[PDB]
Structure formats: structure tokens, C-alpha cells
Symmetry: D2
Subunit: 116 residues, 4 copies
């Protein structure tokens, strides 16, 4: 599903950026001591999102085992990051926005996974 693959890559790039924006904004909060789990998972999500986009971008010598394993990791980490950001969404707009982006990427990863 070439449109599902392209959408997944796009969501990974959007999500990486939303996650790094969220990490930076949490680091700048006066209440940063209460946001350290959010910062950590934001960073985890950004790192896994860019790696996922990269693996999905390659078609030479395609191996479904690797593609599925990376997609699963990406879905799991986007879910964790979305849940953690959701805990602080009322207090912080950057967290609400990051959660949205994480849910969107999780869904695109699951859709792609189901289709492969």
C-alpha cells in the first residue's frame, strides 16, 4: 500500500518535530521538574520516528521482518508519548499538540502494519 507507506513517513516526520518542540518547551517550563518523563518519552518518540521514516523510505532488498519490527516499535512509542503528553495537555498547549501528533502517527503506523 504505497499511499499508506507515504502517509506513514509523512506522519513520522511531523511527529518527530512535534515531539522535539514538546521536549524543548517542557525543558523551558518553570515546572520542568514535573515534566521529566514527558521530556524523556518525547525524545524517545522523536528518535524512533526519524529512524522509522528512514527504514520505510528504503525499498532495495526489502525485508518485511525488519519493516514490521520497526513499525511496531514506532506505534508503541507514539502511544506511550501520546499518553504521557495527554497527562499534561490541559496545563500545556505544546503537550496537547504533541499528543495529537503522536496519536496521528500511531494510527498511520497501525494502518500501514495492517496493510502489509
Amino acid at each position: 500500500d504505497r499511499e499508506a507507506m507515504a502517509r506513514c513517513i509523512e506522519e513520522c516526520l511531523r511527529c518527530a518535530q512535534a515531539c522535539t518542540a514538546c521536549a524543548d518547551a517542557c525543558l523551558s517550563e518553570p515546572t520542568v521538574a514535573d515534566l521529566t518523563k514527558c521530556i524523556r518519552t518525547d525524545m524517545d518518540c522523536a528518535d524512533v520516528c526519524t529512524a522509522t521514516a528512514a527504514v520505510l523510505s528504503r525499498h532495495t532488498g526489502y525485508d518485511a521482518n525488519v519493516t514490521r519490527a520497526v513499525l511496531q516499535a514506532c506505534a508503541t512509542v507514539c502511544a506511550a508519548c501520546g499518553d504521557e503528553c495527554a497527562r499534561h495537555a490541559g496545563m500545556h498547549e505544546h503537550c496537547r499538540v504533541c499528543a495529537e501528533a503522536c496519536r496521528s502517527c500511531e494510527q498511520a503506523c497501525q494502518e500501514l502494519l495492517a496493510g502489509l
Copy 2:
């Protein structure tokens, strides 16, 4: 610099890394891959440096702006070199044309921030 100029350059770096990864893969799949090895290698470098630059820019506050400048200059240099090599193959390979344009837009975005800092 502005938050909107940062965000533009961070997006460009993320997109340029992806574009360079896609181009390197498309070149690897060509039957003429042996002719494309410098393109692939420079794609790989540009993706790595764009990846680092996106992350560094994300944490930019304005303090220790010499870090931001140094990383921007590395990104601009490799994007320009990657574009130059891709352009050598762009008449033959549309994938290289596409990559070259991604490299030019990231190069300009980095330069625009360098002027601002």
C-alpha cells in the same frame, strides 16, 4: 531569529534527511549503481548531518549560539555538496532531481538562519 524561522529550518532538515535516504535507496536499486556511488555516499552524509541539525535546532534557545552556527554551517555545506552530486544524475534519474531540490531548500533555510544569528 524567530520561532517560525527555526521551525521552517527544522522541518527542512527533517525532510532533507528523508529525501536523501530515499535517493540513496533509489540509486542502490539502479542497474547502474556502480556509477552512483559518490551520490549514495554524499546522500548518506547529508542525511546524517540533517538529522543531527534538526535535533540541535530544536533545542536552540539563543544561549551558546556558536553551537547553532557551527551545526548550521555543516548542514549548509553538506546539503550544497549533496545537491551538486545529485544534480550530475538528475537528467538521467528523476529521483536525483527530486533530491537535489530538497538539498537546495534545506541549504537556503540554513543560510537564512545563519544570516539571522
Copy 3:
């Protein structure tokens, strides 16, 4: 175990570098057209090991499904990369070297996953 954690992070960092080196050596071979899956899989492995090292560095024990997900992906891609390198190891010392690095990272990720 923070010392096991550190050992696995080091494995991931060194495996990413090993894979990058191997991909470059394959790229420079006259027989590069026969080595394209090796190169691609080397790139995937480097990308996933790079993300894994970073995610492991931030592991706290909380939300450890994030850590499990990247270790599973990392073990899977390191196994695949080692398989493709091992196929070429008789002709190319650089592939032999890379397979050994992939196998050690594979094993370290598996061990850490068993401990969690």
C-alpha cells in the same frame, strides 16, 4: 542492571558505526551491484541501533514497554543485518567484521530484553 544497560548502549553505538563502515566498504567494491541488500540492511541497522542507544540511555524502568519495543526492533534488524553480512563474509573481510558486530548487539539486546 545499569551496567548491563551501559554495555548494551555501547554495543548499539558500535554496531551502528560498524554497519556504516561496512556499507561504505561494500559501496567501494567493484561487485557493488551484488552487495545492495547488504548496504541497505547495514543502513537500517545503523538507524535502528542509533535510536536504540538513545532510548536506552533514558530508560528509567517506568513505561518499560518503550524499552522493550526498541530492543525487539534492534535485535530483529541486527539479526537480519548479520545474516546478510555473513552471506558475504567468505569473500569480504569487512562483511565478516560487520556480522560479528551485529551478532554481539543482537545478543546484548536479547539479554537485556530477558532481564526486563
Copy 4:
């Protein structure tokens, strides 16, 4: 040449050691009760780690070598390792993780500067 390839190997090794030192320091700072006073350290630790792994990767590649690219990357790595070392050194009195990170940054900075001088 041979001396260059050996200095590149030494710098790659320092980059890998430095990346891990830096991520260990970021993690430790995030865990400190005084995390609010360590946010610049955490930011620069991460910048240094990201640039170090990229630099090791670029230096690993010999196909289609371009000295100008490699120099620009090395300059970035030297500059961030200097910044990271300086910021960690501010806190080294209070935090061993910061002292250890500063030492790794200094050693990586030196190895990058060696290649900038010798290539």
C-alpha cells in the same frame, strides 16, 4: 594516507565514547532534584551526542570523499564538544556525572581538532 586513516579511527572512537558519556550525563541531570538548574547542560549534552554519532558516521566513509564536507562536520563536532565540556565543567564540582562528561568532551574535541589540523 595512513596517518590520516589512523587519526580518523581515533576520532571515531572518541566520538562513540563521547556520545555515551553525554547521554549518560543528560539522563543523570534529568534525574537530579536540581534539574531546573541543569537544563543548559541537558540541552548541550544532547547536542553533543547527536553531533558525535553523525561525525563518527561521516568519518567512516571513504567512498567519494570530499575534504570540505568532512572538515565542516569536524568543525561542528569540535565546537559542540567544547561547548558541552564547558557547560558540564560548571557543574563538575557538584556532580561526578558532569565531571566525567566534561573529560570525555575534552578528549573528543582534541581528536577532532587533530584531524582539522592534520588533514
